[PDB]
């Protein structure tokens, strides 16, 4: 009924070491954090291998869909790869290429200067545009339930789960509060406030600490470390409860449209240029678009920003992190044969946490998880839930912030 014409994959980088080692991380547990085999924030070898499995799976699926050849290397830019300048994203691009097309030496493009941020992955970071402080503050606080106190008050079960995994009551932070007649709870020992600036939004205290620590436990599990969370995380309900704190911070700071639309605008422009039929032309990064397959190696925020800007909602069965390492927002252009009309499908492809833990080789018979998505604002949908090309174009033009374009 339908023929696949084009695919754009926006991928988070693979498993990485923690990006920071702070004094507060030491003070909230009596135990020693496991050390990692690469520098802070770098991709691990295992993370690269997990990405290559997704590349291998995507080759098999795209061959089955008739888009790539079963044997040989894709020719003349049929496949293009763009990565953010960070080590972890560059090496994710290389790992994906190695799985998709081994020995084909597909180039991993970055911006010219790899020592400075690339605004494609967040235009606020180079000051292309700025957030509206009052609008962002009100929008985030409303999505939090009206205040950060309301937000943390409704999540005490998850904070107590994190405290148990940390053995928080025996930590230096708690032992000093016991000596000062103040009771030991993460949220009250580390009050959380929303900080909004022209170029960033963040949360302080327990909310951001919890978001980072629960991601570290997940990374430990995916890395195959023997005892993530000191062996105190023993079932799936516990994993889901812990990562709810991480996903909740992303819901506030990255999915909120008042942030997401600006942060996602350059990626929206690149996705639309890649998916829209037009005479091929070398554009950004020296990549010729449109082409058959474009893989973009970025960050968790990019997945969440695109989700918030485009009203794409999901949770990932079997994967506690809704923006997991190697997770892929996959945009596809399909041609309907009955009338040769053009349609856009979006899905979230991801390894389950168990597939990461077991280093499961992926294939058509053992596929990654996949969640089919719908653009909530699309008014022209086909029977398969895809948006018409014109409908998707209108949604993108409405969502994007022109001042944030490159």
Author numbering: 5 to 410
Which of the paper's sentences describe this entry?
The E. Coli periplasmic phytase, AppA, is a 1D-6-phytase (EC 3.1.3.2) and initial hydrolysis preferentially liberates the phosphate at the 1D-6-position on the inositol ring. HP2Ps catalyse the hydrolysis of phytate via an obligatory phosphohistidine intermediate. The catalytic proton donor is found in a second, short, conserved motif with sequence HD positioned such that the aspartic acid residue functions as the consensus proton donor in the catalytic mechanism.
The low turnover numbers (kcat) for these hydrolysis-compromised variants (only ~0.1% of that seen for the wild-type enzyme) suggests that breakdown of the phosphohistidine intermediate is rate limiting. The residue therefore adopts the g− conformation rather than the preferred g+ conformation for glutamate observed in α-helical environments, which is seen in bacterial MINPPs for which crystal structures are available. Thus, in the AppA-HAE and -HDE variants the E305 sidechain points away from the substrate and towards the active site cavity. The inability of E305 to participate in catalysis is reflected in the similarity of the kinetic parameters for AppA-HAE to those of the proton donor-less AppA-HAT variant and low turnover number for hydrolysis of phytate. AppA-HDE has slightly enlarged pockets A and B due to the loss of the side-chain methyl group of T305, whereas the double mutant AppA-HAE has larger pockets A and B with an overall change in polarity.
